Amino acid sequence: SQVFGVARIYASFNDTFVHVTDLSGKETIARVTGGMKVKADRDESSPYAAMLAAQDVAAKCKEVGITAVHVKIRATGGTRTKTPGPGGQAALRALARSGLRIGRIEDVTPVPSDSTRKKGGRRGRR
RNA sequence: GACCAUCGUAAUGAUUAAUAGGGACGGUCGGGGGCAUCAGUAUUCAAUUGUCAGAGGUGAAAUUCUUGGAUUUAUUGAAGAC
């Protein structure tokens, strides 16, 4: 038998979050960000930061007795970028290499039916 | 000469139907209009949630929010717009 958690990977262009919960999603088991592992604000989204965050989450998951994780990848979404940030892929690869069994992978990036006005002018960032 | 009847003669008297226009009729077509009426996810916020240091934001920083629990996570809501 295998104990399943849910790895919510939030990958933005500024930071990466590796957040493991129960299947209900109410109880957090482990939460680590890229900025927890690197001291420089520019490197919080980096693939390296995301790897270190994922490794630490995986250690804590083993202590609690989680053997397997469902992956929910999330970009910023809404009125912002729907592309996941650079550490999304690195975090996932790190979780797999740490010896957690990867279950189902889903994209849960929030997509509007139609949107409130995006930030920027009509002339855009310049 | 006017004028009103009645009989008579006559092929008795209405040009097409514009690859002009209008109108009717027929089945349709359309993100055309108006008034009601349905959803939709998102965004912000607020109740209940777990969690533990950063989260935000950038070319790089700072302003800002934060161990009274941010951000992240789930649950049920409202609001307005689209």
PDB file of C-alpha atoms (C1' of nucleotides) in Angstrom:
ATOM      1  CA  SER A   1       0.000   0.000   0.000  1.00  0.00           C
ATOM      2  CA  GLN A   2       1.068   3.596  -0.771  1.00  0.00           C
ATOM      3  CA  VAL A   3       0.225   6.805   1.130  1.00  0.00           C
ATOM      4  CA  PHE A   4      -0.665   9.599  -1.333  1.00  0.00           C
ATOM      5  CA  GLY A   5      -0.191  13.340  -0.783  1.00  0.00           C
ATOM      6  CA  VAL A   6      -0.761  16.255  -3.197  1.00  0.00           C
ATOM      7  CA  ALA A   7       2.294  18.312  -4.278  1.00  0.00           C
ATOM      8  CA  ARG A   8       1.028  21.775  -5.290  1.00  0.00           C
ATOM      9  CA  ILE A   9       3.922  23.294  -7.261  1.00  0.00           C
ATOM     10  CA  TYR A  10       3.294  27.041  -7.730  1.00  0.00           C
ATOM     11  CA  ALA A  11       5.885  28.314 -10.245  1.00  0.00           C
ATOM     12  CA  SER A  12       5.966  32.088 -10.830  1.00  0.00           C
ATOM     13  CA  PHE A  13       8.725  34.165 -12.454  1.00  0.00           C
ATOM     14  CA  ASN A  14       9.624  35.584  -8.997  1.00  0.00           C
ATOM     15  CA  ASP A  15       9.450  32.494  -6.720  1.00  0.00           C
ATOM     16  CA  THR A  16       8.694  28.737  -6.650  1.00  0.00           C
ATOM     17  CA  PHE A  17       6.587  27.029  -3.963  1.00  0.00           C
ATOM     18  CA  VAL A  18       6.660  23.285  -3.229  1.00  0.00           C
ATOM     19  CA  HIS A  19       3.617  22.651  -1.018  1.00  0.00           C
ATOM     20  CA  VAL A  20       2.552  19.098  -0.027  1.00  0.00           C
ATOM     21  CA  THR A  21      -0.849  18.456   1.598  1.00  0.00           C
ATOM     22  CA  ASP A  22      -3.251  15.608   2.261  1.00  0.00           C
ATOM     23  CA  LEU A  23      -5.730  14.541  -0.453  1.00  0.00           C
ATOM     24  CA  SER A  24      -8.391  16.866   1.079  1.00  0.00           C
ATOM     25  CA  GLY A  25      -5.935  19.777   0.649  1.00  0.00           C
ATOM     26  CA  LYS A  26      -6.787  21.178   4.122  1.00  0.00           C
ATOM     27  CA  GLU A  27      -3.794  19.881   6.083  1.00  0.00           C
ATOM     28  CA  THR A  28      -0.323  21.050   5.093  1.00  0.00           C
ATOM     29  CA  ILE A  29       2.420  18.498   5.584  1.00  0.00           C
ATOM     30  CA  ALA A  30       5.373  20.474   4.185  1.00  0.00           C
ATOM     31  CA  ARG A  31       5.781  23.897   2.544  1.00  0.00           C
ATOM     32  CA  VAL A  32       9.094  25.259   1.259  1.00  0.00           C
ATOM     33  CA  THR A  33       9.810  28.090  -1.216  1.00  0.00           C
ATOM     34  CA  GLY A  34      12.817  28.918  -3.399  1.00  0.00           C
ATOM     35  CA  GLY A  35      13.419  32.103  -1.367  1.00  0.00           C
ATOM     36  CA  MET A  36      13.828  29.963   1.794  1.00  0.00           C
ATOM     37  CA  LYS A  37      16.908  28.321   0.183  1.00  0.00           C
ATOM     38  CA  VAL A  38      18.614  31.354  -1.451  1.00  0.00           C
ATOM     39  CA  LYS A  39      19.428  34.760   0.106  1.00  0.00           C
ATOM     40  CA  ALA A  40      19.256  36.758  -3.197  1.00  0.00           C
ATOM     41  CA  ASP A  41      15.825  38.013  -4.382  1.00  0.00           C
ATOM     42  CA  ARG A  42      16.778  37.536  -8.068  1.00  0.00           C
ATOM     43  CA  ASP A  43      17.479  33.789  -7.571  1.00  0.00           C
ATOM     44  CA  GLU A  44      14.230  32.812  -5.739  1.00  0.00           C
ATOM     45  CA  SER A  45      12.626  31.540  -8.993  1.00  0.00           C
ATOM     46  CA  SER A  46      15.889  29.827 -10.089  1.00  0.00           C
ATOM     47  CA  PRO A  47      15.876  26.075 -11.014  1.00  0.00           C
ATOM     48  CA  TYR A  48      18.551  25.553  -8.303  1.00  0.00           C
ATOM     49  CA  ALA A  49      16.402  27.117  -5.552  1.00  0.00           C
ATOM     50  CA  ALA A  50      13.422  25.001  -6.641  1.00  0.00           C
ATOM     51  CA  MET A  51      15.538  21.794  -6.493  1.00  0.00           C
ATOM     52  CA  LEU A  52      16.753  22.532  -2.925  1.00  0.00           C
ATOM     53  CA  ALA A  53      13.176  23.350  -1.819  1.00  0.00           C
ATOM     54  CA  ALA A  54      11.827  20.093  -3.314  1.00  0.00           C
ATOM     55  CA  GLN A  55      14.561  17.976  -1.643  1.00  0.00           C
ATOM     56  CA  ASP A  56      13.720  19.426   1.798  1.00  0.00           C
ATOM     57  CA  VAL A  57       9.967  18.858   1.276  1.00  0.00           C
ATOM     58  CA  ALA A  58      10.689  15.249   0.231  1.00  0.00           C
ATOM     59  CA  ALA A  59      12.715  14.624   3.422  1.00  0.00           C
ATOM     60  CA  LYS A  60       9.822  15.918   5.589  1.00  0.00           C
ATOM     61  CA  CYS A  61       7.318  13.839   3.553  1.00  0.00           C
ATOM     62  CA  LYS A  62       9.310  10.645   4.302  1.00  0.00           C
ATOM     63  CA  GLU A  63       9.368  11.433   8.060  1.00  0.00           C
ATOM     64  CA  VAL A  64       5.534  11.646   8.049  1.00  0.00           C
ATOM     65  CA  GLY A  65       5.337   8.452   5.903  1.00  0.00           C
ATOM     66  CA  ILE A  66       4.147   9.774   2.510  1.00  0.00           C
ATOM     67  CA  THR A  67       5.344   7.379  -0.213  1.00  0.00           C
ATOM     68  CA  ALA A  68       3.613   8.985  -3.252  1.00  0.00           C
ATOM     69  CA  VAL A  69       2.478  12.459  -4.439  1.00  0.00           C
ATOM     70  CA  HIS A  70      -0.063  13.711  -6.992  1.00  0.00           C
ATOM     71  CA  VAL A  71       1.391  16.793  -8.749  1.00  0.00           C
ATOM     72  CA  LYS A  72      -0.675  19.965  -9.340  1.00  0.00           C
ATOM     73  CA  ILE A  73       1.398  22.495 -11.327  1.00  0.00           C
ATOM     74  CA  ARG A  74       0.205  26.137 -11.186  1.00  0.00           C
ATOM     75  CA  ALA A  75       1.402  29.281 -12.991  1.00  0.00           C
ATOM     76  CA  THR A  76       0.390  32.753 -11.732  1.00  0.00           C
ATOM     77  CA  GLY A  77      -2.675  32.766 -14.040  1.00  0.00           C
ATOM     78  CA  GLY A  78      -5.791  34.991 -13.758  1.00  0.00           C
ATOM     79  CA  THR A  79      -4.981  38.282 -15.542  1.00  0.00           C
ATOM     80  CA  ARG A  80      -1.192  37.454 -15.445  1.00  0.00           C
ATOM     81  CA  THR A  81       1.091  34.883 -17.211  1.00  0.00           C
ATOM     82  CA  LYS A  82      -0.332  31.374 -17.766  1.00  0.00           C
ATOM     83  CA  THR A  83       3.186  29.992 -18.513  1.00  0.00           C
ATOM     84  CA  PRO A  84       4.764  28.297 -15.396  1.00  0.00           C
ATOM     85  CA  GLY A  85       7.996  29.821 -14.051  1.00  0.00           C
ATOM     86  CA  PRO A  86      11.503  28.267 -14.508  1.00  0.00           C
ATOM     87  CA  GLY A  87      11.640  26.235 -11.259  1.00  0.00           C
ATOM     88  CA  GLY A  88       8.359  24.324 -11.928  1.00  0.00           C
ATOM     89  CA  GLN A  89      10.128  21.587 -13.932  1.00  0.00           C
ATOM     90  CA  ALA A  90      13.172  21.498 -11.593  1.00  0.00           C
ATOM     91  CA  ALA A  91      10.968  20.981  -8.491  1.00  0.00           C
ATOM     92  CA  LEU A  92       9.075  18.094 -10.137  1.00  0.00           C
ATOM     93  CA  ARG A  93      12.346  16.381 -11.239  1.00  0.00           C
ATOM     94  CA  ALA A  94      13.769  16.842  -7.705  1.00  0.00           C
ATOM     95  CA  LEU A  95      10.674  15.269  -6.073  1.00  0.00           C
ATOM     96  CA  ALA A  96      11.015  12.234  -8.397  1.00  0.00           C
ATOM     97  CA  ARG A  97      14.779  11.895  -7.723  1.00  0.00           C
ATOM     98  CA  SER A  98      14.179  12.128  -3.938  1.00  0.00           C
ATOM     99  CA  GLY A  99      12.343   8.752  -4.103  1.00  0.00           C
ATOM    100  CA  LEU A 100       8.720   9.921  -3.810  1.00  0.00           C
ATOM    101  CA  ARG A 101       6.479   8.049  -6.267  1.00  0.00           C
ATOM    102  CA  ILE A 102       4.886  10.487  -8.757  1.00  0.00           C
ATOM    103  CA  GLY A 103       1.128   9.946  -9.255  1.00  0.00           C
ATOM    104  CA  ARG A 104      -1.094  11.978 -11.606  1.00  0.00           C
ATOM    105  CA  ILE A 105       0.189  15.311 -12.984  1.00  0.00           C
ATOM    106  CA  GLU A 106      -2.379  18.111 -13.626  1.00  0.00           C
ATOM    107  CA  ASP A 107      -2.142  21.807 -14.616  1.00  0.00           C
ATOM    108  CA  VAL A 108      -4.349  23.907 -12.282  1.00  0.00           C
ATOM    109  CA  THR A 109      -3.338  27.375 -13.623  1.00  0.00           C
ATOM    110  CA  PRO A 110      -6.396  29.680 -13.039  1.00  0.00           C
ATOM    111  CA  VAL A 111      -7.941  30.634 -16.414  1.00  0.00           C
ATOM    112  CA  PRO A 112     -10.796  33.238 -16.610  1.00  0.00           C
ATOM    113  CA  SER A 113     -13.947  32.891 -18.740  1.00  0.00           C
ATOM    114  CA  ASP A 114     -13.283  36.540 -19.188  1.00  0.00           C
ATOM    115  CA  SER A 115     -10.928  38.752 -17.250  1.00  0.00           C
ATOM    116  CA  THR A 116     -10.781  41.949 -15.222  1.00  0.00           C
ATOM    117  CA  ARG A 117      -8.493  44.549 -16.778  1.00  0.00           C
ATOM    118  CA  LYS A 118      -4.849  43.426 -16.778  1.00  0.00           C
ATOM    119  CA  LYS A 119      -2.229  45.562 -15.055  1.00  0.00           C
ATOM    120  CA  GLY A 120      -0.455  47.991 -17.420  1.00  0.00           C
ATOM    121  CA  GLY A 121      -1.780  50.737 -19.663  1.00  0.00           C
ATOM    122  CA  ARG A 122      -3.169  50.169 -23.126  1.00  0.00           C
ATOM    123  CA  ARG A 123       0.395  51.112 -24.188  1.00  0.00           C
ATOM    124  CA  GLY A 124       1.821  48.383 -21.920  1.00  0.00           C
ATOM    125  CA  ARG A 125       5.033  48.126 -19.881  1.00  0.00           C
ATOM    126  CA  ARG A 126       7.670  50.271 -21.614  1.00  0.00           C
TER     127      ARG A 126
ATOM    128  C1'   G B   1     -76.088  80.337 -81.381  1.00  0.00           C
ATOM    129  C1'   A B   2     -75.620  78.307 -76.746  1.00  0.00           C
ATOM    130  C1'   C B   3     -78.244  74.193 -73.255  1.00  0.00           C
ATOM    131  C1'   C B   4     -80.732  69.444 -71.318  1.00  0.00           C
ATOM    132  C1'   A B   5     -82.885  64.700 -72.952  1.00  0.00           C
ATOM    133  C1'   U B   6     -83.488  60.271 -76.365  1.00  0.00           C
ATOM    134  C1'   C B   7     -82.050  57.129 -80.455  1.00  0.00           C
ATOM    135  C1'   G B   8     -78.023  56.360 -84.120  1.00  0.00           C
ATOM    136  C1'   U B   9     -72.702  55.331 -85.876  1.00  0.00           C
ATOM    137  C1'   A B  10     -67.904  53.061 -83.874  1.00  0.00           C
ATOM    138  C1'   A B  11     -62.723  47.516 -83.773  1.00  0.00           C
ATOM    139  C1'   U B  12     -66.063  52.624 -79.157  1.00  0.00           C
ATOM    140  C1'   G B  13     -61.844  54.377 -75.024  1.00  0.00           C
ATOM    141  C1'   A B  14     -56.522  51.803 -70.166  1.00  0.00           C
ATOM    142  C1'   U B  15     -48.601  51.272 -74.494  1.00  0.00           C
ATOM    143  C1'   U B  16     -44.621  47.946 -72.356  1.00  0.00           C
ATOM    144  C1'   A B  17     -44.105  45.458 -67.560  1.00  0.00           C
ATOM    145  C1'   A B  18     -37.098  48.343 -67.510  1.00  0.00           C
ATOM    146  C1'   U B  19     -31.259  42.112 -65.221  1.00  0.00           C
ATOM    147  C1'   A B  20     -35.572  50.751 -62.868  1.00  0.00           C
ATOM    148  C1'   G B  21     -38.148  51.354 -58.062  1.00  0.00           C
ATOM    149  C1'   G B  22     -41.922  50.369 -54.342  1.00  0.00           C
ATOM    150  C1'   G B  23     -45.482  46.749 -52.049  1.00  0.00           C
ATOM    151  C1'   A B  24     -47.265  41.589 -51.021  1.00  0.00           C
ATOM    152  C1'   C B  25     -46.096  36.374 -50.407  1.00  0.00           C
ATOM    153  C1'   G B  26     -42.544  31.871 -49.288  1.00  0.00           C
ATOM    154  C1'   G B  27     -38.756  29.291 -46.729  1.00  0.00           C
ATOM    155  C1'   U B  28     -34.715  31.044 -44.484  1.00  0.00           C
ATOM    156  C1'   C B  29     -30.056  33.638 -42.642  1.00  0.00           C
ATOM    157  C1'   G B  30     -27.439  36.827 -39.210  1.00  0.00           C
ATOM    158  C1'   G B  31     -21.835  38.156 -32.916  1.00  0.00           C
ATOM    159  C1'   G B  32     -28.216  43.828 -36.500  1.00  0.00           C
ATOM    160  C1'   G B  33     -31.436  46.433 -32.428  1.00  0.00           C
ATOM    161  C1'   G B  34     -34.343  46.900 -27.813  1.00  0.00           C
ATOM    162  C1'   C B  35     -36.613  44.884 -23.017  1.00  0.00           C
ATOM    163  C1'   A B  36     -36.616  40.811 -19.667  1.00  0.00           C
ATOM    164  C1'   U B  37     -33.506  36.190 -18.313  1.00  0.00           C
ATOM    165  C1'   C B  38     -29.659  32.442 -17.757  1.00  0.00           C
ATOM    166  C1'   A B  39     -24.820  30.738 -16.756  1.00  0.00           C
ATOM    167  C1'   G B  40     -19.364  30.958 -16.694  1.00  0.00           C
ATOM    168  C1'   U B  41     -14.385  30.876 -14.546  1.00  0.00           C
ATOM    169  C1'   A B  42     -11.364  34.715 -12.857  1.00  0.00           C
ATOM    170  C1'   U B  43     -10.178  39.137  -9.803  1.00  0.00           C
ATOM    171  C1'   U B  44     -10.454  41.552  -4.960  1.00  0.00           C
ATOM    172  C1'   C B  45     -12.286  40.995  -0.297  1.00  0.00           C
ATOM    173  C1'   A B  46     -14.488  38.525   3.981  1.00  0.00           C
ATOM    174  C1'   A B  47     -15.832  34.240   7.246  1.00  0.00           C
ATOM    175  C1'   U B  48     -13.719  28.807   8.692  1.00  0.00           C
ATOM    176  C1'   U B  49      -8.984  26.160   7.529  1.00  0.00           C
ATOM    177  C1'   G B  50      -4.027  23.797   8.302  1.00  0.00           C
ATOM    178  C1'   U B  51       0.890  25.296   8.097  1.00  0.00           C
ATOM    179  C1'   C B  52       5.660  28.097   9.469  1.00  0.00           C
ATOM    180  C1'   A B  53       9.442  32.541   7.499  1.00  0.00           C
ATOM    181  C1'   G B  54       9.542  35.056   4.702  1.00  0.00           C
ATOM    182  C1'   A B  55       5.944  36.799   0.841  1.00  0.00           C
ATOM    183  C1'   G B  56       5.623  41.059  -2.891  1.00  0.00           C
ATOM    184  C1'   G B  57       8.090  43.304  -6.892  1.00  0.00           C
ATOM    185  C1'   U B  58      12.581  43.918 -10.608  1.00  0.00           C
ATOM    186  C1'   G B  59      17.517  44.305 -15.581  1.00  0.00           C
ATOM    187  C1'   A B  60      19.205  44.743 -10.357  1.00  0.00           C
ATOM    188  C1'   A B  61      17.066  46.932  -5.928  1.00  0.00           C
ATOM    189  C1'   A B  62      13.813  49.573  -2.695  1.00  0.00           C
ATOM    190  C1'   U B  63       8.742  51.265  -1.273  1.00  0.00           C
ATOM    191  C1'   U B  64       4.733  47.399   1.019  1.00  0.00           C
ATOM    192  C1'   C B  65       2.359  43.015   3.808  1.00  0.00           C
ATOM    193  C1'   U B  66       4.307  40.012   7.712  1.00  0.00           C
ATOM    194  C1'   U B  67       5.365  34.564  14.171  1.00  0.00           C
ATOM    195  C1'   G B  68      -1.702  38.923  16.448  1.00  0.00           C
ATOM    196  C1'   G B  69       0.398  34.299  11.509  1.00  0.00           C
ATOM    197  C1'   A B  70       1.877  37.050   5.420  1.00  0.00           C
ATOM    198  C1'   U B  71       2.397  34.482   0.912  1.00  0.00           C
ATOM    199  C1'   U B  72       1.023  29.401  -0.143  1.00  0.00           C
ATOM    200  C1'   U B  73      -3.464  25.551   0.931  1.00  0.00           C
ATOM    201  C1'   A B  74      -8.598  23.908   1.342  1.00  0.00           C
ATOM    202  C1'   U B  75     -13.996  25.069   2.467  1.00  0.00           C
ATOM    203  C1'   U B  76     -18.420  28.252   1.793  1.00  0.00           C
ATOM    204  C1'   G B  77     -19.784  33.424   0.357  1.00  0.00           C
ATOM    205  C1'   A B  78     -20.687  38.374  -1.647  1.00  0.00           C
ATOM    206  C1'   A B  79     -19.829  42.195  -4.908  1.00  0.00           C
ATOM    207  C1'   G B  80     -19.200  44.505  -9.233  1.00  0.00           C
ATOM    208  C1'   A B  81     -17.223  44.183 -14.114  1.00  0.00           C
ATOM    209  C1'   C B  82     -15.929  41.210 -18.269  1.00  0.00           C
TER     210        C B  82
END
